[PDB]
Amino acid sequence: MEPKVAELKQKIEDTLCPFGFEVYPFQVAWYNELLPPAFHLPLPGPTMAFLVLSTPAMFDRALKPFLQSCHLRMLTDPVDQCMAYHLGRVRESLPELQIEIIADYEMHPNRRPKILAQTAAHVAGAAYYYQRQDSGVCIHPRFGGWFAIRGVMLLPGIEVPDLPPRKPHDCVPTRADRIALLEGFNFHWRDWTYRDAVTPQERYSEEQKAYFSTPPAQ
Numbered sequence: 001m002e003p004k005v006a007e008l009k010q011k012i013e014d015t016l017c018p019f020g021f022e023v024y025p026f027q028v029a030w031y032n033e034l035l036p037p038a039f040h041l042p043l044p045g046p047t048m049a050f051l052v053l054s055t056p057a058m059f060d061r062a063l064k065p066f067l068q069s070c071h072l073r074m075l076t077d078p079v080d081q082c083m084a085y086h087l088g089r090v091r092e093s094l095p096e097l098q099i100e101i102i103a104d105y106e107m108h109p110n111r112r113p114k115i116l117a118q119t120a121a122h123v124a125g126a127a128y129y130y131q132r133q134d135s136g137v138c139i140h141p142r143f144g145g146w147f148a149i150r151g152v153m154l155l156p157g158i159e160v161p162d163l164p165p166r167k168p169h170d171c172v173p174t175r176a177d178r179i180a181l182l183e184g185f186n187f188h189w190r191d192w193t194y195r196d197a198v199t200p201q202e203r204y205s206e207e208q209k210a211y212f213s214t215p216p217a218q
Contacts (some may be wrong), residue, residue: 005048005160007023008094012050012153017094019086020058021150024051024124027163028154031123039114043154044162047196050153052087052123057147059211062086077216080105083150090153100154105141116150125166137185137194141169146203171198 007139012023031043034196041049054062066072066082073081091099096141107115118138122129128137140147172178177197184194204212 020061024126026124046159048155052151054150059208068087102135103151125168128168141171144198
């Protein structure tokens with residue numbers, strides 16, 4: 001890949017990864033090819049995009065700091081504000097270019113562009129999106145179900161038509177475990193054993209578990 005592309009890629013990861021984030025590059029075309037024009041990313045096929053995932057490490061590295069800093073505001077939501085703070089830091093560190101950013105909290109009805117978080121996770125090779133054919137759940141090769149899709153970043157004009165398509169790891173290969181997953185997700189979602197389909201390195205700590213099991217109310 002062009003030195004420009006390699007540098008900008010590394011700048012993003014040096015900005016996000018030390019804070020419990022992961023970034024996966026992809027071509028817009030891969031996402032659009034299995035989607036009708038209505039749900040397309042309104043950009044040429046070879047346009048570079050980045051899928052952003054948060055890991056279990058992001059709570060302690062990103063959320064607990066910030067929450068104890070002057071950047072914290074009131075009438076929003078602590079977790080959203082943290083996303084908007086770190087994704088802002090990406091903009092700051094790459095001031096030369098145009099970055100269209102859709103954070104997870106902006107993936108809702110009556111807003112464009114319409115992102116399908118789990119489909120993005122699959123095309124970027126970030127996490128395998130297990131469906132009926134194989135409601136679906138997608139599993140991280142390293143963290144199982146203990147992670148979240150946090151945003152997608154679009155970089156207009158920066159095109160990478162020779163970026164190689166990486167398929168997500170089929171980390172739950174057997175037809176048994178797949179059903180043991182989908183039915184443990186569709187019917188017993190409060191039993192987070194399904195997230196251990198692949199047994200993670202880090203798991204959510206007790207304070208993290210408590211925090212996310214809380215219904216958003218201050």
